[PDB]
Amino acid sequence: PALRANIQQALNHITKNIHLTQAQMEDVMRSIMQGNATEAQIGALMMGLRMKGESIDEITAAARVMRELAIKIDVSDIQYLVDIVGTGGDGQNLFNVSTASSFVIAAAGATIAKHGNSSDLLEQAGINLDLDMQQTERCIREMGVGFLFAPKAMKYAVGPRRELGIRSIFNLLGPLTNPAGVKRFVIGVFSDELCRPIAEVMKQLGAEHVMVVHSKDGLDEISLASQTYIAELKNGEVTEWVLNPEDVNIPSQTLSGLIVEDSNASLKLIKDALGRKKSDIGEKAANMIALNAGAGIYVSGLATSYKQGVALAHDIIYGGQALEKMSILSEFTKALKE
Amino acid sequence: PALRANIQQALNHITKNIHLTQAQMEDVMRSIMQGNATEAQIGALMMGLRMKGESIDEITAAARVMRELAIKIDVSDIQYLVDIVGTGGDGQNLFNVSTASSFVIAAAGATIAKHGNSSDLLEQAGINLDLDMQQTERCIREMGVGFLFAPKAMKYAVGPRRELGIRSIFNLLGPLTNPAGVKRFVIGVFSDELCRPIAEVMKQLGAEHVMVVHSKDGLDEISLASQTYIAELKNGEVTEWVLNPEDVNIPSQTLSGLIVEDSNASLKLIKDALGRKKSDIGEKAANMIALNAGAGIYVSGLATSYKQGVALAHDIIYGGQALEKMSILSEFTKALKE
Numbered sequence: 001p002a003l004r005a006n007i008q009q010a011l012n013h014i015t016k017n018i019h020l021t022q023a024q025m026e027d028v029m030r031s032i033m034q035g036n037a038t039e040a041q042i043g044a045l046m047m048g049l050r051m052k053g054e055s056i057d058e059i060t061a062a063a064r065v066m067r068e069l070a071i072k073i074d075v076s077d078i079q080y081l082v083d084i085v086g087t088g089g090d091g092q093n094l095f096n097v098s099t100a101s102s103f104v105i106a107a108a109g110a111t112i113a114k115h116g117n118s119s120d121l122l123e124q125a126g127i128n129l130d131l132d133m134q135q136t137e138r139c140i141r142e143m144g145v146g147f148l149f150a151p152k153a154m155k156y157a158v159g160p161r162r163e164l165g166i167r168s169i170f171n172l173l174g175p176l177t178n179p180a181g182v183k184r185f186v187i188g189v190f191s192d193e194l195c196r197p198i199a200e201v202m203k204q205l206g207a208e209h210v211m212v213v214h215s216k217d218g219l220d221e222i223s224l225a226s227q228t229y230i231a232e233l234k235n236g237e238v239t240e241w242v243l244n245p246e247d248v249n250i251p252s253q254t255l256s257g258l259i260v261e262d263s264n265a266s267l268k269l270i271k272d273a274l275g276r277k278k279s280d281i282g283e284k285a286a287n288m289i290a291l292n293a294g295a296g297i298y299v300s301g302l303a304t305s306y307k308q309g310v311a312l313a314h315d316i317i318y319g320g321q322a323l324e325k326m327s328i329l330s331e332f333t334k335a336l337k338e
Numbered sequence: 339p340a341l342r343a344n345i346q347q348a349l350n351h352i353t354k355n356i357h358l359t360q361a362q363m364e365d366v367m368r369s370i371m372q373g374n375a376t377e378a379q380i381g382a383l384m385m386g387l388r389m390k391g392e393s394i395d396e397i398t399a400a401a402r403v404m405r406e407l408a409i410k411i412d413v414s415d416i417q418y419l420v421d422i423v424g425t426g427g428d429g430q431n432l433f434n435v436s437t438a439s440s441f442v443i444a445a446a447g448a449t450i451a452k453h454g455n456s457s458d459l460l461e462q463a464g465i466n467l468d469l470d471m472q473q474t475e476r477c478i479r480e481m482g483v484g485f486l487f488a489p490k491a492m493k494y495a496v497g498p499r500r501e502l503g504i505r506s507i508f509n510l511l512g513p514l515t516n517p518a519g520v521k522r523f524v525i526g527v528f529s530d531e532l533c534r535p536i537a538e539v540m541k542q543l544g545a546e547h548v549m550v551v552h553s554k555d556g557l558d559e560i561s562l563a564s565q566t567y568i569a570e571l572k573n574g575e576v577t578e579w580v581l582n583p584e585d586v587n588i589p590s591q592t593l594s595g596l597i598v599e600d601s602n603a604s605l606k607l608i609k610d611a612l613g614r615k616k617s618d619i620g621e622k623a624a625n626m627i628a629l630n631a632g633a634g635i636y637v638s639g640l641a642t643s644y645k646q647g648v649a650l651a652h653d654i655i656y657g658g659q660a661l662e663k664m665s666i667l668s669e670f671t672k673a674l675k676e
Contacts, residue, residue: 008503011502015385038377038497038501039376040380040497042378042381043378044384045385048385051385159376163346163376164379164382165346165349166382
């Protein structure tokens with residue numbers, strides 16, 4: 001109709017390197033999400049936006065539309081509420097740092113509603129994820145941690161995305177649609193260049209405090225092995241800085257021993273890293289967790305600097321309380337089933 | 339398979355602004371033509387190549403593949419054999435200049451195998467186009483003019499093309515696949531910038547003499563109303579020059595009266611323009627035909643300069659012989675049916 005017209009209008013603008021307006025991008029993105037765009041059109045939009053360069057306004061509008069059509073639960077009343085997300089990096093299968101970090105964050109006193117997709121890992125740990133949306137809110141409120149699976153009816157992008165095989169605007173929108181109404185985030189991205197614009201996107205989306213991170217060694221998280229680039233939104237201001245583990249009194253180490261072959265090894269390593277008596281690899285994995293959980297504790301508002309956040313995370317990790325939070329979350333969700 | 343792999347490889351190269359090699363483009367283009375590419379992939383390839391800029395090598399390889407899968411007849415033995423084609427310009431419905439030019443070219447002594455797609459026009463003139471490929475070759479050999487309809491099983495590009503609504507690499511390949519094995523061409527393109535690269539494409543495709551034309555007023559032919567940009571391939575050398583009607587003793591005039599509402603008016607105007615007693619608009623249309631048929635007579639080898647070609651065309655147009663060639667072609671094709 002006129003909804004096919006605006007798609008062709010958009011593609012034409014994109015070929016002339018003219019950015020869609022937020023108005024135009026909502027219309028386009030809403031059309032894609034409602035099956036009002038053809039597959040070829042979706043492939044073209046993806047490729048065109050990728051080569052032009054997606055603008056802040058385009059990504060903002062698009063995420064705005066995505067969250068508009070997500071199931072949502074409201075836990076924005078909760079103090080120290082935070083999410084940790086990532087686009088995925090160059091992977092490379094590190095153990096599940098963000099899953100471990102979740103337990104550390106919750107054990108420290110903040111609350112995380114981790115929006116996601118590893119699930120086998122958690123079930124492997126005796127944690128039952130067969131949870132309705134209300135049982136999940138119970139986890140968040142009563143345990144300080146809940147796992148929002150899963151997350152879509154993003155069904156229309158799925159085929160085009162695997163068929164093109166390129167990173168596109170869609171790799172960005174996934175992490176930006178928190179169903180829990182969270183306002184404070186650590187967001188991993190796949191390049192240094194994405195850090196500032198995603199920070200700016202979260203500003204326009206009304207976020208309060210955000211660290212957008214990409215490490216030199218290709219991770220969408222803070223690396224233990226190398227420097228990490230940061231764009232930080234705080235108090236309406238966005239700044240960019242660089243972080244080395246040594247800045248927070250943690251010695252950089254290689255990622256050797258942190259790459260895992262499966263869920264069972266990941267879980268094994270997590271338990272070691274969060275436990276009171278850690279192996280030599282456990283200590284390394286613990287330090288990497290401290291860097292990332294520390295960023296969560298900080299943007300949550302529970303700690304007042306990144307450094308303090310890391311110190312608090314480190315206390316929890318070496319004190320064992322995060323491991324106990326795993327055990328407790330397991331019992332709770334087993335009870336939630338009967 | 340590995341044929342989906344090379345598509346994703348290609349798209350990735352295109353996003354990094356790396357041109358496909360001819361080898362890679364054949365593979366890709368062959369896949370699209372054999373249904374081995376998805377719609378989203380085709381949309382993406384179109385958009386990606388459009389924004390990167392298609393290279394000589396990419397267009398060459400792609401046309402090469404297109405002609406590989408066309409029906410072909412061999413009339414390359416014929417002396418002064420020529421084709422006139424166009425991508426289409428900014429249209430804007432001028433009367434069918436190239437159709438009139440066909441009759442002038444043939445009446446002058448050259449031969450044209452006009453590859454195409456107006457058909458109503460010709461049938462309106464009593465010309466029967468319900469012709470098998472051998473009856474068509476008979477037209478070319480015995481009359482000096484034949485109409486190659488129609489032209490494809492380019493079925494796989496058709497939907498993506500109307501859905502995207504952008505000019506793409508496909509708008510270029512249509513005119514470049516002469517089924518008759520013609521080596522001398524006048525090719526209209528939609529921008530000045532396309533003239534030289536298409537001339538270079540025809541060189542790599544083994545053409546002998548080519549004029550690639552785009553007029554300042556947006557036509558993929560030589561305008562009577564404005565200047566026309568030319569890239570010319572001749573003797574293995576490509577040159578670029580600019581043409582005004584006055585250079586060949588024809589006064590530039592506005593296109594007023596040359597825009598037509600339908601086939602019947604187009605045919606009416608053609609007959610006037612090719613007839614012995616021309617109206618004031620007939621004379622203008624005749625002059626525009628002289629410019630374009632002259633380019634055909636020239637690249638055919640029948641005339642040794644563009645100027646001489648135009649003079650010969652002009653003699654035929656004002657002498658009436660091209661109109662008589664229409665009448666004769668009509669009788670011939672009516673006989674070819676019984």
